[PDB]
Design a binder for this molecule. Structure first.
Ligand SMILES: C[C@@]1(c2cc(CNC3(C(F)(F)F)CC3)c(F)cc2F)CCSC(N)=N1
Length: 380
């Protein structure tokens, strides 16, 4: 209901992610840690990489235990390698508890840390099934719940605005001051990523009319560690086609839609109203029942601040194609208060009390709707 100590416990800079302060070891070493619902390892810089403000110094911790096992973790765009151990962990602006958790001490990386960012590790909040090297490495939140009385759920309010960003991570509950209206829940299809099922997509109220299975090819997930709304290729093609149409009073280079060039307007003259809203219908809690979440151009047209060769307002098209399914990143989550109700295997959405909107349109969460054959939307 109300967890005042945890409100506003997230920080970041635009495009560089949201982080929470944590301590690791005895005595406690403070580190800023990126909050990532799209992975399941707790991995921290443990060596003086030049990009890092600080790093985990295992030699200073009396409660450090070595698992004597390494882990090599490649991504599409980078990689880290580290040494597994366990140690005492806490969240200063979180529950008043200390737990023994797995920690991967990162000892080598490439294109992982960000030059100029203020975080030096990652907190993977997803499930053991996708932990590296395998699912016997218990994720942080699983340890937290097993070792304490913290309820098995957490919620994220990501507020957006290099400008500073902020938000809240409520550990073990929900703060009803962070949202308006009602929460609506969609089932977690499988506990690996936070996988959900999209059953309908509308641009400005007009249905895309695809076989809904396409929306979830090969999965759809909710991911605080991804900035864009990523869409499967076939779906991205139809969504762009329809967004181009709704916004055809102005024209834009093909490269802009492909995220290959920015687009700029005179400071203060961005044509929000020429861009359509985007609605995702999600599978609901009941047979044949769905609800819809709606986002604005304010969410999927993102300011790019660090353009030294321009003085105008420049923006990046932040919807993009994927070959790993739909990814509801920050473009989606910044419109909503999102509740990761692990105990009940469901994800709640409500309109965020802090989301960015204008005088004509606001983000919305609405239901119930009648949607048939929603089980056919899932990819097997
Ligand atoms: C672990 C990973 C990851 C995320 C970020 C966070 N990416 C950001 C974001 F959080 F803002 F999205 C900084 C740009 C990294 F920095 C490094 C990673 F390996 C892999 C890529 S997608 C994901 N959910 N998690």
């Amino acid at each position: 209901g109300s967890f005042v100590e945890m409100v506003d416990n997230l920080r970041g800079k635009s495009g560089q992610g949201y982080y929470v302060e944590m301590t690791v070891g005895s005595p406690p070493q403070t580190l800023n840690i990126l909050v990532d619902t799209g992975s399941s390892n707790f991995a921290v810089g443990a060596a003086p990489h030049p990009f890092l403000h600080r790093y985990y110094q295992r030699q200073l911790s009396s409660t450090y235990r070595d698992l004597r096992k390494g882990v090599y973790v490649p991504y599409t765009q980078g990689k880290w390698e580290g040494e597994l151990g366990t140690d005492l962990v806490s969240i200063p602006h979180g529950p008043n508890v200390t737990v023994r958790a797995n920690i991967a001490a990162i000892t080598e990386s490439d294109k992982f840390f960000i030059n100029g960012s203020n975080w030096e590790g990652i907190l993977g909040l997803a499930y053991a099934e996708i932990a590296r090297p395998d699912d016997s490495l218990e994720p942080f939140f699983d340890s937290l719940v097993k070792q304490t009385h913290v309820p098995n759920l957490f919620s994220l309010q990501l507020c957006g605005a290099l400008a500073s960003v902020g938000g809240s991570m409520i550990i073990g509950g929900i703060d009803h001051s962070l949202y308006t209206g009602s929460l609506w829940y969609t089932p977690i299809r499988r506990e690996w990523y936070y996988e959900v099922i999209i059953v309908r997509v509308e641009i400005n109220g007009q249905d895309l009319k695809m076989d809904c299975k396409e929306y979830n090819y090969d999965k759809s997930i909710v991911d605080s560690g991804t900035t864009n709304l990523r869409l499967p290729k076939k779906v991205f093609e139809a969504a762009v086609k329809s967004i181009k149409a709704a916004s055809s009073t102005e024209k834009f280079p093909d490269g802009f839609w492909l995220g290959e060039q920015l687009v700029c307007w005179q400071a203060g003259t961005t044509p929000w109203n020429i861009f359509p809203v985007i609605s995702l219908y999600l599978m609901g809690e009941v047979t044949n029942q769905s609800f819809r979440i709606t986002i604005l151009p304010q969410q999927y047209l993102r300011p790019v601040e660090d353009v030294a060769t321009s003085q105008d307002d420049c923006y990046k098209f932040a919807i993009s194609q994927s070959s790993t399914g739909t990814v509801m990143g920050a473009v989606i989550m910044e419109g909503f208060y999102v509740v990761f109700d692990r105990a009940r295997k469901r994800i709640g959405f409500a309109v965020s009390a802090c989301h960015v909107h204008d005088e004509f349109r606001t983000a919305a969460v609405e239901g119930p709707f009648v949607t048939l054959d929603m089980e056919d939307c899932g990819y097997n």
